[PDB]
PDB file of N, CA and C and ligand atoms in Angstrom:
ATOM      1  N   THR A   1       0.773  -1.349   0.246  1.00 41.08           N
ATOM      2  CA  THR A   1      -0.166   0.251   0.097  1.00 41.08           C
ATOM      3  C   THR A   1       1.075   1.250   0.017  1.00 41.08           C
ATOM      4  N   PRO A   2       0.531   2.385  -1.012  1.00 40.66           N
ATOM      5  CA  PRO A   2       1.241   3.333  -1.023  1.00 40.66           C
ATOM      6  C   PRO A   2       1.141   4.545   0.035  1.00 40.66           C
ATOM      7  N   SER A   3       1.700   5.436   0.322  1.00 40.78           N
ATOM      8  CA  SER A   3       1.529   6.496   1.153  1.00 40.78           C
ATOM      9  C   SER A   3       1.355   6.143   2.834  1.00 40.78           C
ATOM     10  N   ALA A   4       1.854   4.717   2.946  1.00 46.92           N
ATOM     11  CA  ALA A   4       1.672   4.303   4.110  1.00 46.92           C
ATOM     12  C   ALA A   4       2.500   5.192   5.430  1.00 46.92           C
ATOM     13  N   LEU A   5       3.692   5.196   5.055  1.00 44.02           N
ATOM     14  CA  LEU A   5       4.745   5.826   5.501  1.00 44.02           C
ATOM     15  C   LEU A   5       4.959   7.518   5.490  1.00 44.02           C
ATOM     16  N   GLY A   6       4.090   8.235   4.894  1.00 42.64           N
ATOM     17  CA  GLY A   6       4.038   9.201   4.278  1.00 42.64           C
ATOM     18  C   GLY A   6       4.171  10.450   5.541  1.00 42.64           C
ATOM     19  N   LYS A   7       3.936  10.117   6.732  1.00 38.40           N
ATOM     20  CA  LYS A   7       4.257  10.929   7.846  1.00 38.40           C
ATOM     21  C   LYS A   7       5.707  11.390   7.993  1.00 38.40           C
ATOM     22  N   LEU A   8       6.640  10.209   7.885  1.00 37.74           N
ATOM     23  CA  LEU A   8       7.954  10.626   8.217  1.00 37.74           C
ATOM     24  C   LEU A   8       8.569  11.217   6.862  1.00 37.74           C
ATOM     25  N   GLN A   9       8.032  10.783   5.741  1.00 35.92           N
ATOM     26  CA  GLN A   9       8.522  11.223   4.069  1.00 35.92           C
ATOM     27  C   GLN A   9       8.141  12.661   4.098  1.00 35.92           C
ATOM     28  N   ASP A  10       7.181  13.113   4.694  1.00 38.57           N
ATOM     29  CA  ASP A  10       6.689  14.421   4.640  1.00 38.57           C
ATOM     30  C   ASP A  10       7.903  15.320   5.546  1.00 38.57           C
ATOM     31  N   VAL A  11       8.106  14.879   6.604  1.00 34.63           N
ATOM     32  CA  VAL A  11       8.983  15.666   7.796  1.00 34.63           C
ATOM     33  C   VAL A  11      10.524  15.643   6.690  1.00 34.63           C
ATOM     34  N   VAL A  12      10.847  14.654   6.169  1.00 34.83           N
ATOM     35  CA  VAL A  12      12.094  14.651   5.354  1.00 34.83           C
ATOM     36  C   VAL A  12      12.304  15.439   4.190  1.00 34.83           C
ATOM     37  N   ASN A  13      10.866  15.471   3.514  1.00 36.90           N
ATOM     38  CA  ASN A  13      10.952  16.428   2.614  1.00 36.90           C
ATOM     39  C   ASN A  13      10.767  17.893   2.575  1.00 36.90           C
ATOM     40  N   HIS A  14      10.191  17.965   3.702  1.00 37.04           N
ATOM     41  CA  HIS A  14      10.378  19.487   4.319  1.00 37.04           C
ATOM     42  C   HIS A  14      11.359  20.078   4.646  1.00 37.04           C
ATOM     43  N   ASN A  15      12.313  19.229   5.535  1.00 36.47           N
ATOM     44  CA  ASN A  15      13.406  19.536   5.655  1.00 36.47           C
ATOM     45  C   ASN A  15      14.423  19.727   4.445  1.00 36.47           C
ATOM     46  N   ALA A  16      14.418  18.979   3.587  1.00 36.35           N
ATOM     47  CA  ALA A  16      15.115  19.388   2.391  1.00 36.35           C
ATOM     48  C   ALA A  16      14.752  20.280   1.616  1.00 36.35           C
ATOM     49  N   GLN A  17      13.417  20.292   1.387  1.00 34.96           N
ATOM     50  CA  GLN A  17      12.922  21.839   0.466  1.00 34.96           C
ATOM     51  C   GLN A  17      13.456  22.898   1.309  1.00 34.96           C
ATOM     52  N   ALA A  18      13.087  23.055   2.877  1.00 34.35           N
ATOM     53  CA  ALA A  18      13.681  24.200   3.499  1.00 34.35           C
ATOM     54  C   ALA A  18      15.161  24.316   3.426  1.00 34.35           C
ATOM     55  N   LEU A  19      15.896  23.613   3.030  1.00 29.97           N
ATOM     56  CA  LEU A  19      17.508  23.739   2.932  1.00 29.97           C
ATOM     57  C   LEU A  19      17.646  23.957   1.446  1.00 29.97           C
ATOM     58  N   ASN A  20      16.793  23.324   0.637  1.00 31.70           N
ATOM     59  CA  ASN A  20      16.968  23.750  -0.670  1.00 31.70           C
ATOM     60  C   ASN A  20      16.512  25.471  -1.208  1.00 31.70           C
ATOM     61  N   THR A  21      15.413  25.796  -0.457  1.00 30.43           N
ATOM     62  CA  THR A  21      15.342  27.030  -0.437  1.00 30.43           C
ATOM     63  C   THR A  21      16.438  27.980   0.187  1.00 30.43           C
ATOM     64  N   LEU A  22      16.714  27.602   1.222  1.00 29.66           N
ATOM     65  CA  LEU A  22      17.939  28.289   2.114  1.00 29.66           C
ATOM     66  C   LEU A  22      18.861  28.313   0.951  1.00 29.66           C
ATOM     67  N   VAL A  23      19.288  27.295   0.125  1.00 31.86           N
ATOM     68  CA  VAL A  23      20.513  27.681  -0.601  1.00 31.86           C
ATOM     69  C   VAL A  23      20.329  28.274  -1.961  1.00 31.86           C
ATOM     70  N   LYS A  24      18.541  28.623  -2.290  1.00 30.18           N
ATOM     71  CA  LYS A  24      18.481  29.055  -3.595  1.00 30.18           C
ATOM     72  C   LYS A  24      18.336  30.437  -3.351  1.00 30.18           C
ATOM     73  N   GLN A  25      18.203  30.781  -2.171  1.00 27.89           N
ATOM     74  CA  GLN A  25      17.814  32.464  -1.843  1.00 27.89           C
ATOM     75  C   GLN A  25      19.403  32.693  -1.804  1.00 27.89           C
ATOM     76  N   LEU A  26      20.485  32.295  -1.765  1.00 27.12           N
ATOM     77  CA  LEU A  26      21.605  32.780  -1.824  1.00 27.12           C
ATOM     78  C   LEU A  26      22.140  33.094  -3.385  1.00 27.12           C
ATOM     79  N   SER A  27      21.350  32.685  -4.114  1.00 29.19           N
ATOM     80  CA  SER A  27      21.928  33.177  -5.283  1.00 29.19           C
ATOM     81  C   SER A  27      20.663  34.130  -5.909  1.00 29.19           C
ATOM     82  N   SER A  28      19.626  34.696  -5.219  1.00 31.69           N
ATOM     83  CA  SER A  28      18.965  35.783  -5.218  1.00 31.69           C
ATOM     84  C   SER A  28      19.334  37.236  -4.965  1.00 31.69           C
ATOM     85  N   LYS A  29      19.420  38.201  -6.320  1.00 33.03           N
ATOM     86  CA  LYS A  29      20.239  39.280  -5.773  1.00 33.03           C
ATOM     87  C   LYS A  29      18.861  40.238  -5.205  1.00 33.03           C
ATOM     88  N   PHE A  30      18.959  40.506  -4.193  1.00 32.55           N
ATOM     89  CA  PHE A  30      18.315  41.486  -3.340  1.00 32.55           C
ATOM     90  C   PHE A  30      18.265  42.970  -3.725  1.00 32.55           C
ATOM     91  N   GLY A  31      17.929  43.174  -5.200  1.00 37.54           N
ATOM     92  CA  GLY A  31      18.205  44.915  -5.813  1.00 37.54           C
ATOM     93  C   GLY A  31      19.835  45.262  -5.709  1.00 37.54           C
ATOM     94  N   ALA A  32      20.627  44.197  -5.566  1.00 38.16           N
ATOM     95  CA  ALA A  32      22.177  44.298  -5.818  1.00 38.16           C
ATOM     96  C   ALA A  32      22.331  44.043  -7.319  1.00 38.16           C
ATOM     97  N   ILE A  33      23.437  44.472  -7.710  1.00 38.36           N
ATOM     98  CA  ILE A  33      23.762  44.139  -9.314  1.00 38.36           C
ATOM     99  C   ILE A  33      24.275  42.696  -9.329  1.00 38.36           C
ATOM    100  N   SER A  34      24.766  42.054  -8.617  1.00 43.05           N
ATOM    101  CA  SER A  34      25.290  40.699  -8.604  1.00 43.05           C
ATOM    102  C   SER A  34      24.697  40.005  -7.086  1.00 43.05           C
ATOM    103  N   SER A  35      24.817  38.637  -7.416  1.00 43.35           N
ATOM    104  CA  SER A  35      24.556  37.618  -6.230  1.00 43.35           C
ATOM    105  C   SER A  35      25.808  37.441  -5.689  1.00 43.35           C
ATOM    106  N   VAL A  36      26.833  37.503  -6.057  1.00 43.45           N
ATOM    107  CA  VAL A  36      28.366  37.284  -5.847  1.00 43.45           C
ATOM    108  C   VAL A  36      29.097  38.377  -4.980  1.00 43.45           C
ATOM    109  N   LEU A  37      29.631  38.209  -3.864  1.00 40.29           N
ATOM    110  CA  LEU A  37      30.141  39.057  -3.479  1.00 40.29           C
ATOM    111  C   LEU A  37      31.843  39.401  -3.780  1.00 40.29           C
ATOM    112  N   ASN A  38      32.008  38.464  -4.283  1.00 38.08           N
ATOM    113  CA  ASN A  38      33.266  38.355  -5.214  1.00 38.08           C
ATOM    114  C   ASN A  38      32.823  39.238  -6.758  1.00 38.08           C
ATOM    115  N   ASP A  39      31.766  39.222  -7.320  1.00 36.88           N
ATOM    116  CA  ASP A  39      31.918  39.751  -8.345  1.00 36.88           C
ATOM    117  C   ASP A  39      31.488  41.474  -8.203  1.00 36.88           C
ATOM    118  N   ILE A  40      31.300  41.829  -6.833  1.00 38.99           N
ATOM    119  CA  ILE A  40      31.142  43.136  -6.571  1.00 38.99           C
ATOM    120  C   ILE A  40      32.080  44.041  -5.945  1.00 38.99           C
ATOM    121  N   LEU A  41      32.753  42.916  -4.932  1.00 37.67           N
ATOM    122  CA  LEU A  41      33.992  43.696  -4.244  1.00 37.67           C
ATOM    123  C   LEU A  41      35.407  43.876  -5.779  1.00 37.67           C
ATOM    124  N   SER A  42      35.543  42.961  -6.547  1.00 37.90           N
ATOM    125  CA  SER A  42      36.444  43.088  -7.524  1.00 37.90           C
ATOM    126  C   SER A  42      35.855  43.974  -8.584  1.00 37.90           C
ATOM    127  N   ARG A  43      34.848  44.504  -8.636  1.00 37.23           N
ATOM    128  CA  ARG A  43      34.164  45.300  -9.572  1.00 37.23           C
ATOM    129  C   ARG A  43      34.252  46.906  -9.266  1.00 37.23           C
ATOM    130  N   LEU A  44      33.494  46.948  -8.009  1.00 34.89           N
ATOM    131  CA  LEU A  44      33.131  48.297  -7.577  1.00 34.89           C
ATOM    132  C   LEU A  44      34.167  48.620  -6.336  1.00 34.89           C
ATOM    133  N   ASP A  45      34.220  49.874  -6.378  1.00 33.83           N
ATOM    134  CA  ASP A  45      35.215  50.408  -5.108  1.00 33.83           C
ATOM    135  C   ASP A  45      34.562  50.256  -3.467  1.00 33.83           C
ATOM    136  N   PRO A  46      35.036  50.104  -2.615  1.00 33.76           N
ATOM    137  CA  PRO A  46      34.325  49.966  -1.330  1.00 33.76           C
ATOM    138  C   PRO A  46      33.250  50.726  -0.918  1.00 33.76           C
ATOM    139  N   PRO A  47      33.336  52.183  -1.018  1.00 36.13           N
ATOM    140  CA  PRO A  47      32.187  53.064  -0.527  1.00 36.13           C
ATOM    141  C   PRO A  47      31.003  52.827  -1.485  1.00 36.13           C
ATOM    142  N   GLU A  48      31.116  52.313  -2.891  1.00 40.06           N
ATOM    143  CA  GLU A  48      30.139  51.721  -3.675  1.00 40.06           C
ATOM    144  C   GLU A  48      29.774  50.462  -3.487  1.00 40.06           C
ATOM    145  N   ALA A  49      30.620  49.546  -3.550  1.00 43.68           N
ATOM    146  CA  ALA A  49      30.326  48.226  -3.401  1.00 43.68           C
ATOM    147  C   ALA A  49      29.493  47.901  -1.767  1.00 43.68           C
ATOM    148  N   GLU A  50      30.085  48.511  -0.908  1.00 41.78           N
ATOM    149  CA  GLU A  50      29.045  48.534   0.525  1.00 41.78           C
ATOM    150  C   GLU A  50      27.582  48.732   0.412  1.00 41.78           C
TER     151      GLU A  50
ATOM    152  N   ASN B   1      40.444  57.090 -31.834  1.00 41.52           N
ATOM    153  CA  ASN B   1      40.861  57.749 -33.066  1.00 41.52           C
ATOM    154  C   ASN B   1      40.361  57.736 -34.309  1.00 41.52           C
ATOM    155  N   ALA B   2      39.179  57.728 -34.409  1.00 37.82           N
ATOM    156  CA  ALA B   2      38.550  57.598 -35.630  1.00 37.82           C
ATOM    157  C   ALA B   2      38.298  59.133 -35.843  1.00 37.82           C
ATOM    158  N   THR B   3      38.399  59.612 -37.341  1.00 35.12           N
ATOM    159  CA  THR B   3      38.634  60.730 -37.604  1.00 35.12           C
ATOM    160  C   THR B   3      37.007  61.270 -37.850  1.00 35.12           C
ATOM    161  N   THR B   4      35.998  60.224 -38.384  1.00 33.16           N
ATOM    162  CA  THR B   4      34.880  60.995 -38.770  1.00 33.16           C
ATOM    163  C   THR B   4      33.865  60.029 -37.695  1.00 33.16           C
ATOM    164  N   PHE B   5      33.026  60.785 -37.149  1.00 34.09           N
ATOM    165  CA  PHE B   5      32.100  60.131 -35.944  1.00 34.09           C
ATOM    166  C   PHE B   5      30.830  60.341 -36.662  1.00 34.09           C
ATOM    167  N   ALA B   6      29.756  59.295 -36.283  1.00 35.70           N
ATOM    168  CA  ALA B   6      28.679  59.598 -36.617  1.00 35.70           C
ATOM    169  C   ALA B   6      27.698  60.075 -35.964  1.00 35.70           C
ATOM    170  N   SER B   7      26.345  60.623 -36.290  1.00 35.62           N
ATOM    171  CA  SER B   7      25.208  61.790 -35.602  1.00 35.62           C
ATOM    172  C   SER B   7      25.229  60.548 -34.381  1.00 35.62           C
ATOM    173  N   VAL B   8      24.141  61.449 -33.750  1.00 36.76           N
ATOM    174  CA  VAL B   8      23.473  60.915 -32.696  1.00 36.76           C
ATOM    175  C   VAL B   8      22.406  59.979 -32.548  1.00 36.76           C
ATOM    176  N   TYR B   9      21.924  60.534 -33.776  1.00 36.68           N
ATOM    177  CA  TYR B   9      20.426  59.589 -34.337  1.00 36.68           C
ATOM    178  C   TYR B   9      20.724  58.419 -34.949  1.00 36.68           C
ATOM    179  N   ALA B  10      22.258  58.265 -35.588  1.00 35.78           N
ATOM    180  CA  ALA B  10      22.616  57.153 -36.204  1.00 35.78           C
ATOM    181  C   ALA B  10      23.921  56.576 -35.540  1.00 35.78           C
ATOM    182  N   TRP B  11      24.082  56.532 -34.251  1.00 33.16           N
ATOM    183  CA  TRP B  11      25.246  56.100 -33.514  1.00 33.16           C
ATOM    184  C   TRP B  11      26.008  54.922 -34.091  1.00 33.16           C
ATOM    185  N   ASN B  12      27.365  54.816 -34.296  1.00 33.10           N
ATOM    186  CA  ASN B  12      27.781  53.646 -34.534  1.00 33.10           C
ATOM    187  C   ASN B  12      27.852  52.641 -33.423  1.00 33.10           C
ATOM    188  N   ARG B  13      27.855  51.315 -34.061  1.00 34.98           N
ATOM    189  CA  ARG B  13      27.960  50.271 -33.012  1.00 34.98           C
ATOM    190  C   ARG B  13      29.059  49.241 -33.517  1.00 34.98           C
ATOM    191  N   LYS B  14      30.132  49.153 -32.784  1.00 35.13           N
ATOM    192  CA  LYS B  14      31.024  48.469 -32.677  1.00 35.13           C
ATOM    193  C   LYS B  14      31.326  47.259 -31.529  1.00 35.13           C
ATOM    194  N   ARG B  15      31.419  45.976 -31.987  1.00 34.58           N
ATOM    195  CA  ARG B  15      31.628  45.164 -31.112  1.00 34.58           C
ATOM    196  C   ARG B  15      33.168  44.641 -30.792  1.00 34.58           C
ATOM    197  N   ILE B  16      33.164  44.693 -29.483  1.00 36.97           N
ATOM    198  CA  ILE B  16      34.523  44.179 -29.216  1.00 36.97           C
ATOM    199  C   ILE B  16      34.652  42.603 -28.481  1.00 36.97           C
ATOM    200  N   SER B  17      35.383  42.181 -29.100  1.00 36.87           N
ATOM    201  CA  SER B  17      35.311  40.415 -29.172  1.00 36.87           C
ATOM    202  C   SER B  17      36.582  39.804 -29.318  1.00 36.87           C
ATOM    203  N   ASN B  18      36.982  38.828 -28.265  1.00 34.78           N
ATOM    204  CA  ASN B  18      38.276  38.145 -28.921  1.00 34.78           C
ATOM    205  C   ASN B  18      39.742  38.823 -28.758  1.00 34.78           C
ATOM    206  N   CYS B  19      39.777  39.683 -27.665  1.00 35.53           N
ATOM    207  CA  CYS B  19      40.888  40.472 -27.457  1.00 35.53           C
ATOM    208  C   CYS B  19      41.314  40.656 -26.268  1.00 35.53           C
ATOM    209  N   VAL B  20      42.174  41.606 -26.152  1.00 37.44           N
ATOM    210  CA  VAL B  20      42.500  41.711 -24.479  1.00 37.44           C
ATOM    211  C   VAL B  20      42.354  43.229 -24.582  1.00 37.44           C
ATOM    212  N   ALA B  21      41.408  43.534 -23.566  1.00 38.31           N
ATOM    213  CA  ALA B  21      41.069  44.670 -23.271  1.00 38.31           C
ATOM    214  C   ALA B  21      41.749  45.321 -22.300  1.00 38.31           C
ATOM    215  N   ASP B  22      42.892  46.074 -22.774  1.00 36.99           N
ATOM    216  CA  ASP B  22      43.844  47.071 -22.129  1.00 36.99           C
ATOM    217  C   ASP B  22      43.326  48.476 -22.088  1.00 36.99           C
ATOM    218  N   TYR B  23      42.503  48.853 -21.190  1.00 32.75           N
ATOM    219  CA  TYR B  23      41.776  49.988 -20.993  1.00 32.75           C
ATOM    220  C   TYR B  23      42.793  51.116 -20.639  1.00 32.75           C
ATOM    221  N   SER B  24      44.270  51.019 -20.489  1.00 33.16           N
ATOM    222  CA  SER B  24      44.903  51.824 -20.142  1.00 33.16           C
ATOM    223  C   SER B  24      45.300  52.920 -21.312  1.00 33.16           C
ATOM    224  N   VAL B  25      45.037  52.350 -22.732  1.00 34.45           N
ATOM    225  CA  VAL B  25      45.167  53.086 -23.843  1.00 34.45           C
ATOM    226  C   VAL B  25      44.173  54.184 -23.895  1.00 34.45           C
ATOM    227  N   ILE B  26      42.902  53.904 -23.175  1.00 34.56           N
ATOM    228  CA  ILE B  26      41.868  55.373 -23.207  1.00 34.56           C
ATOM    229  C   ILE B  26      42.258  56.599 -22.749  1.00 34.56           C
ATOM    230  N   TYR B  27      43.319  56.168 -21.485  1.00 34.67           N
ATOM    231  CA  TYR B  27      43.717  57.501 -20.988  1.00 34.67           C
ATOM    232  C   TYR B  27      44.755  58.409 -21.592  1.00 34.67           C
ATOM    233  N   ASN B  28      45.340  57.722 -22.914  1.00 33.43           N
ATOM    234  CA  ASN B  28      46.101  58.471 -23.393  1.00 33.43           C
ATOM    235  C   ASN B  28      45.613  59.671 -24.232  1.00 33.43           C
ATOM    236  N   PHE B  29      44.330  59.708 -24.732  1.00 34.74           N
ATOM    237  CA  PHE B  29      43.734  61.151 -25.208  1.00 34.74           C
ATOM    238  C   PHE B  29      43.574  62.027 -24.394  1.00 34.74           C
ATOM    239  N   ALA B  30      42.988  62.882 -25.005  1.00 36.98           N
ATOM    240  CA  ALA B  30      42.828  64.442 -24.342  1.00 36.98           C
ATOM    241  C   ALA B  30      42.119  64.203 -22.919  1.00 36.98           C
ATOM    242  N   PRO B  31      42.095  65.286 -22.062  1.00 36.79           N
ATOM    243  CA  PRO B  31      41.291  64.917 -21.093  1.00 36.79           C
ATOM    244  C   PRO B  31      39.767  64.978 -20.941  1.00 36.79           C
ATOM    245  N   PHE B  32      39.047  64.134 -20.614  1.00 36.69           N
ATOM    246  CA  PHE B  32      37.921  63.995 -21.079  1.00 36.69           C
ATOM    247  C   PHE B  32      36.919  64.645 -19.925  1.00 36.69           C
ATOM    248  N   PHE B  33      35.955  65.204 -20.500  1.00 40.40           N
ATOM    249  CA  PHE B  33      34.771  66.085 -19.655  1.00 40.40           C
ATOM    250  C   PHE B  33      34.007  65.560 -18.854  1.00 40.40           C
ATOM    251  N   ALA B  34      33.902  64.214 -18.982  1.00 42.38           N
ATOM    252  CA  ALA B  34      32.841  63.492 -18.155  1.00 42.38           C
ATOM    253  C   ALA B  34      33.188  61.621 -18.320  1.00 42.38           C
ATOM    254  N   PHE B  35      33.806  61.389 -17.180  1.00 43.03           N
ATOM    255  CA  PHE B  35      34.388  59.553 -17.392  1.00 43.03           C
ATOM    256  C   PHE B  35      33.788  58.884 -16.120  1.00 43.03           C
ATOM    257  N   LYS B  36      32.079  58.928 -16.210  1.00 44.36           N
ATOM    258  CA  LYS B  36      31.120  58.493 -15.204  1.00 44.36           C
ATOM    259  C   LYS B  36      31.325  56.887 -15.689  1.00 44.36           C
ATOM    260  N   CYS B  37      31.399  56.298 -14.332  1.00 43.84           N
ATOM    261  CA  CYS B  37      31.218  54.742 -14.446  1.00 43.84           C
ATOM    262  C   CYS B  37      29.968  54.329 -13.827  1.00 43.84           C
ATOM    263  N   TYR B  38      29.096  53.814 -14.554  1.00 44.22           N
ATOM    264  CA  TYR B  38      28.096  52.862 -13.801  1.00 44.22           C
ATOM    265  C   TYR B  38      28.126  51.456 -13.760  1.00 44.22           C
ATOM    266  N   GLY B  39      28.012  50.904 -12.497  1.00 42.67           N
ATOM    267  CA  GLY B  39      27.849  49.246 -12.131  1.00 42.67           C
ATOM    268  C   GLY B  39      29.378  49.065 -11.943  1.00 42.67           C
ATOM    269  N   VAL B  40      30.397  49.558 -12.713  1.00 45.04           N
ATOM    270  CA  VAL B  40      31.805  49.314 -12.961  1.00 45.04           C
ATOM    271  C   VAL B  40      32.746  50.653 -12.159  1.00 45.04           C
ATOM    272  N   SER B  41      33.628  50.003 -11.588  1.00 44.62           N
ATOM    273  CA  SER B  41      34.807  51.204 -11.320  1.00 44.62           C
ATOM    274  C   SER B  41      36.003  51.202 -12.124  1.00 44.62           C
ATOM    275  N   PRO B  42      36.187  52.861 -12.419  1.00 42.93           N
ATOM    276  CA  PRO B  42      37.010  52.905 -13.492  1.00 42.93           C
ATOM    277  C   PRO B  42      38.994  52.734 -13.455  1.00 42.93           C
ATOM    278  N   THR B  43      39.048  51.927 -12.159  1.00 41.59           N
ATOM    279  CA  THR B  43      40.286  52.048 -11.600  1.00 41.59           C
ATOM    280  C   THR B  43      40.574  50.675 -11.970  1.00 41.59           C
ATOM    281  N   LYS B  44      39.649  49.699 -11.722  1.00 42.36           N
ATOM    282  CA  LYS B  44      39.662  48.227 -11.915  1.00 42.36           C
ATOM    283  C   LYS B  44      38.737  47.610 -13.099  1.00 42.36           C
ATOM    284  N   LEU B  45      38.972  48.362 -14.256  1.00 45.03           N
ATOM    285  CA  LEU B  45      38.594  48.209 -15.368  1.00 45.03           C
ATOM    286  C   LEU B  45      39.358  46.755 -16.050  1.00 45.03           C
ATOM    287  N   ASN B  46      40.769  47.006 -15.816  1.00 46.04           N
ATOM    288  CA  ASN B  46      41.673  46.090 -16.260  1.00 46.04           C
ATOM    289  C   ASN B  46      41.817  44.786 -15.538  1.00 46.04           C
ATOM    290  N   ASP B  47      41.274  44.728 -14.672  1.00 45.69           N
ATOM    291  CA  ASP B  47      41.437  43.070 -14.173  1.00 45.69           C
ATOM    292  C   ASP B  47      40.032  42.573 -14.264  1.00 45.69           C
ATOM    293  N   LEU B  48      38.746  43.142 -14.608  1.00 46.61           N
ATOM    294  CA  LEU B  48      37.891  42.777 -15.197  1.00 46.61           C
ATOM    295  C   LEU B  48      37.566  41.504 -16.363  1.00 46.61           C
ATOM    296  N   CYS B  49      36.736  40.859 -16.438  1.00 53.16           N
ATOM    297  CA  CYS B  49      36.533  40.112 -17.628  1.00 53.16           C
ATOM    298  C   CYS B  49      34.908  40.039 -18.014  1.00 53.16           C
ATOM    299  N   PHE B  50      34.658  40.733 -19.208  1.00 52.65           N
ATOM    300  CA  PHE B  50      33.546  40.974 -19.997  1.00 52.65           C
ATOM    301  C   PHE B  50      32.761  40.051 -20.731  1.00 52.65           C
TER     302      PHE B  50
HETATM  303  C1  LIG C   1      44.745  60.114 -33.270  1.00 53.58           C
HETATM  304  O1  LIG C   1      44.431  60.200 -34.856  1.00 53.58           O
HETATM  305  C2  LIG C   1      45.674  61.425 -35.065  1.00 53.58           C
HETATM  306  C3  LIG C   1      45.492  61.647 -36.461  1.00 53.58           C
HETATM  307  O2  LIG C   1      45.782  60.554 -37.563  1.00 53.58           O
HETATM  308  C4  LIG C   1      46.956  61.319 -34.893  1.00 53.58           C
HETATM  309  O3  LIG C   1      48.042  62.197 -35.058  1.00 53.58           O
HETATM  310  C5  LIG C   1      46.875  60.879 -33.217  1.00 53.58           C
HETATM  311  O4  LIG C   1      48.474  60.396 -33.019  1.00 53.58           O
HETATM  312  C6  LIG C   1      46.084  60.036 -32.776  1.00 53.58           C
HETATM  313  N1  LIG C   1      46.310  59.741 -31.364  1.00 53.58           N
HETATM  314  C7  LIG C   1      46.322  58.777 -30.720  1.00 53.58           C
HETATM  315  C8  LIG C   1      46.461  58.695 -29.362  1.00 53.58           C
HETATM  316  O5  LIG C   1      46.929  57.703 -31.424  1.00 53.58           O
END
């Protein structure tokens, strides 16, 4: 019978999805020119990259 | 160093590719009236890769 152990599967899937969302939000540029700090520090001056 | 430039309504469009972008040769010309850089720093252009 399927979905018999769905309770623990839901917990592990929620944990995996939370981790995936947390690691995906890293690539989201929140109004900045880029999502990589190395692409901003090596391109803009400190007073403008800050 | 072009002799004849195009008008503002029909501005020219040259594409730079497959070459070493040494921006130090730009400063060799006459003093510029405006050297505003947006999204990039005029000092670290020689270290970037476009
Ligand atoms: C720009 O062109 C003129 C005319 O050919 C030349 O005399 C001058 O040396 C050039 N400037 C540079 C920086 O190459």
